[model samples]
Target: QDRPKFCYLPDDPGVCKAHIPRFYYNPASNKCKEFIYGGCGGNANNFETRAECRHTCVASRKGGPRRP
Candidate 1:
């Protein structure tokens, strides 16, 4: 009926100071992007790779490649 709880959550880069590049799903723009993730904090929306982010929040729920 609806998207996953984490998919709709805001992309959190955490509070700590780290230079780790991470991907997160942004429901507002319906896309996955990169952000600087701290050593701690964040939600499930965060992913290690862009493909993982898209698969988790985009491709999984939506129809495959074709569209009108």
Candidate 2:
């Protein structure tokens, strides 16, 4: 099975690039942080805080340290 990759989620910190406080879900880190919208580019994954974003995105089982 396969799918459209779209814009790959940031493995590290995410940047909304907004002058105001925005929110983006970081699948790698699995935490929603106040971000700055890039004033142009962005994704649908934008949301509020951890509790808010996590509410939307499905959570996988927590494992261990990064190997990839």
Candidate 3:
């Protein structure tokens, strides 16, 4: 199976102006990168940190350092 649907979404900073730093999975690059979140109106792809983003979207094969 593939990752969750949200993982495929592009990084969206949203419309509001909160200036909150967040991370989103970049399917094109196959990695998580930092982005500015508006604090509202964004999608589920948004994450509080890069660690969480990688855990959800990046493939880890259930353990250790391994390729997807």
Candidate 4:
């Protein structure tokens, strides 16, 4: 498989705005959304690529940390 590109998507106002660090896939908008990603959030929906965002979101998953 080909390598993925960088986070070229600059945080857009409302289009593709990334609030914080760590990223995740948001299926609703079919884009990767950002989160503080506090450790221990389990393992699911976590995508290093926005591509995965559009690719994964459909499935309920997790990544980064948790709130426990």
Top candidate, metric lDDT: 3
TM values, all candidates: 0.74, 0.50, 0.74, 0.38
lDDT rank, highest first?
3, 1, 2, 4
lDDT of each residue in 12-37, candidate 1, tens digit only? 88789878888888878977888888
Show model 2 residue runs off by greater than 4 Å: 1-8, 11-18, 59-68
Clashes (backbone N, CA, C under 3 Å), per candidate, total 0, 8, 0, 12
Candidate 2 to truth, TM? 0.50
Model 3 — TM-score against the truth? 0.74
Q: lDDT (0-100) at residue 1 of candidate 2?
A: 9
Worst-scoring 10-residue span by lDDT in model 3: 59-68
Candidate 1 lDDT for residue 13:
81
Candidate 2 per-residue lDDT over residues 1-68, each given as its tens digit: 03123213542224544475666566556456666555566666555466766655634545768858
* Candidate scoring better on TM-score of 1 and 2: 1
Per-residue CA lDDT of model 4 for 10-53, tens digit only, reads 33233343343556554345457765544443244445566555
Model 4 lDDT on a 0 to 1 scale: 0.46
